[PDB]
Symmetry: C4
Subunit: 209 residues, 4 copies
Amino acid sequence: MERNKLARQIIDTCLEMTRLGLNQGAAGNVSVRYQDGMLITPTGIPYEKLTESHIVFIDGNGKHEEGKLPSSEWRFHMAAYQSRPDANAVVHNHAVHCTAVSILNRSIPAIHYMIAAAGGNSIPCAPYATFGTRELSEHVALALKNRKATLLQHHGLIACEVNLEKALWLAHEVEVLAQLYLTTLAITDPVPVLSDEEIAVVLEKFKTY
Amino acid sequence: MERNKLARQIIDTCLEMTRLGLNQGAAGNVSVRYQDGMLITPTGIPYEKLTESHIVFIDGNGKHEEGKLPSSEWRFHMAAYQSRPDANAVVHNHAVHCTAVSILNRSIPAIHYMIAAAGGNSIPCAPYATFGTRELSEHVALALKNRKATLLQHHGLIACEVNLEKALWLAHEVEVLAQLYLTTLAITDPVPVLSDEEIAVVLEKFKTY
Amino acid sequence: MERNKLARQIIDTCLEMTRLGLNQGAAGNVSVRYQDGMLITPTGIPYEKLTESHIVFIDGNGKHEEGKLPSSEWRFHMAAYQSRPDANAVVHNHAVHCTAVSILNRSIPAIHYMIAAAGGNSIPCAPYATFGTRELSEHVALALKNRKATLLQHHGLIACEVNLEKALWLAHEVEVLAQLYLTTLAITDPVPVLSDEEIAVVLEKFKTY
Amino acid sequence: MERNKLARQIIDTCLEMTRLGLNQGAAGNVSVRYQDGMLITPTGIPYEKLTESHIVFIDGNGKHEEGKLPSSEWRFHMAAYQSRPDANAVVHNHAVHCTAVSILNRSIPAIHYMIAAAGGNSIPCAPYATFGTRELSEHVALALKNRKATLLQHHGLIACEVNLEKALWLAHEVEVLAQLYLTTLAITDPVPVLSDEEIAVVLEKFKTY
Ligand SMILES: [Zn+2]
Ligand SMILES: [Zn+2]
Ligand SMILES: [Zn+2]
Ligand SMILES: [Zn+2]
């Protein structure tokens, strides 16, 4: 759990994210909780040129290491960590289906039982605010209160979890749910959903196993 | 036909399933008929970390080997084997087009002559029940009575066949049919289909060759 | 131009066809004109297990070599060669967009200037007939009279050209046109097209260069 | 910055363009500003057979080197360079989503904040004219006046930037925006957009960082 190991996992997570087709437009950024702040990807460097040394440490005060420029979206990664103490990693991307659903400004409802992976019966959509602002950070923080992933209106996705592996897995699953919702929405509106009772059973079953 | 050989084929089938784009969300599971029960993939292990030793034997009583946790969806694999004596392998996934059609709760009708690969003029959609339950297992068993593949409402797909190669092939073909049906459904409802007579000719022709 | 060289190109064409995403469902078949008939892919053998020795020679009488089973769809490859003397290679697949357009039973009109690659202002759709029949062969032959590619209703695509490279290229371009037509058809009906005069200019320009 | 180095980058850009799924139909062409004209890809040679020696120099008078045939679309690459003095590289392709939006003859409006990457609140669509003509070149030149990328009606996309890396990046981002617009357009018309004020803030923020 030295800095270098966490740094390699961030980079591996970026590469896997691009392999999976979630990092369309080179827009993603990934962070892990570390010491009193976080390790995040830098702005301006293509994912394929990234080395351990490029990863940027940002303390709990928001001061970043000298000589390195963190992601232009670092502020809501820090909002995530302060809003969800259990989160140890954060994945953000502009994946196409998640983003199209966020353009409609809709939340994804319970069209599939795997929706319970993010914590409840839906995937919320936080209202728009300019990227990098304190206003965007407050919407994200309120949205992650009872959910581990959220859409950002006219923007993309944020997913958090106990480690990078699980955070990537969740981000990917939300992209799948987003694609299921847009494919069926074009056929019928509204789309059939599972009841709240049904989702409460699945949630208990996921706690158990 | 030793256990290890069947175990390698299960793992190879998972990898090919992911290559083909059918294992979106790491949700699939694969089994083969063996001795008095089956060999199935374990729960919790990413497909890329799988080794021969991870494959779990489950007997005809439903008891699994000590120290190994089988897939959380093993029960309907055992339903498949008891309902279709000719089936020797079972592929289950949450492939995006199959699953979107199952969210609409529709069966796929005869829009293409290859529909006859699963046994008749359609691909049914079994009613929803919580994953891992005996109720889900009964719907699956009734649906596979006269068909080799079925959709599961709000869930995904199950396909079975005489060996893994053919079961993967069928699962993939149903995903193609699902995508053909959703693409044309967005344009026109209902979608043009081939008549029952026409499908009976194709079925006879597939018996012959 | 020995048989073995043509045989390797057929196999390479299958592999490239699968790489390009056009051979969904393992359904394609490829042939080249040779001697008094053709060399075609065999039925039953997965594309990745294919070797030079598997390629089947079928003479001008329709008799195939002893001990080898040609594609179940060889008959319309032979129809293509008798209907278009200039064709030296034939690619057939069940590519998803081409096939969805053939399910609607529509021809692809002039939505893009590259439509002229197949010879005119459209891509026709030949009426359905059972696969492998003489009736299907007659529709295909009439459709290829003034066009180098055609859709087959409820079925797929046939493209022909002077060599395999160009035949693959055309097949791929028709899949792109098919996808352009289904994407815009879901938004507006009918889709804007280029005039007949405009296509006549492009056709002359393609003759020139 | 010798000719050979620029030539390798053109070729690498073609390969990456095909990897990204933007060069559907082998239709793209790439150029860089050089000396008194440009270096462009040749017509007729598949991207995978390209070598440094194939790259064609075209002077400021439009005369190309002896013995080499430049792209059939070289003329609007030269229009781009004369219309935008800051552009040093030009990427053109027939990417499927960009092209479908150009078939509708619509401009892409501000559905996402990344729209500001091409310079304003939209991605224009230049009117159709036959490929390779002086009339097409004038529409392209007028469209790139205040934008770094444009759609071409019934045709495709042109993107320009200070170097190939950035030009590819922009072309790819416009394909993502195009796909976001067609996916949401099928659900609702018109699609929600960000206001002009909001885009002016983002534009200033991109100048800053
Ligand atoms: Zn972002
Ligand atoms: Zn399942
Ligand atoms: Zn066929
Ligand atoms: Zn072009």
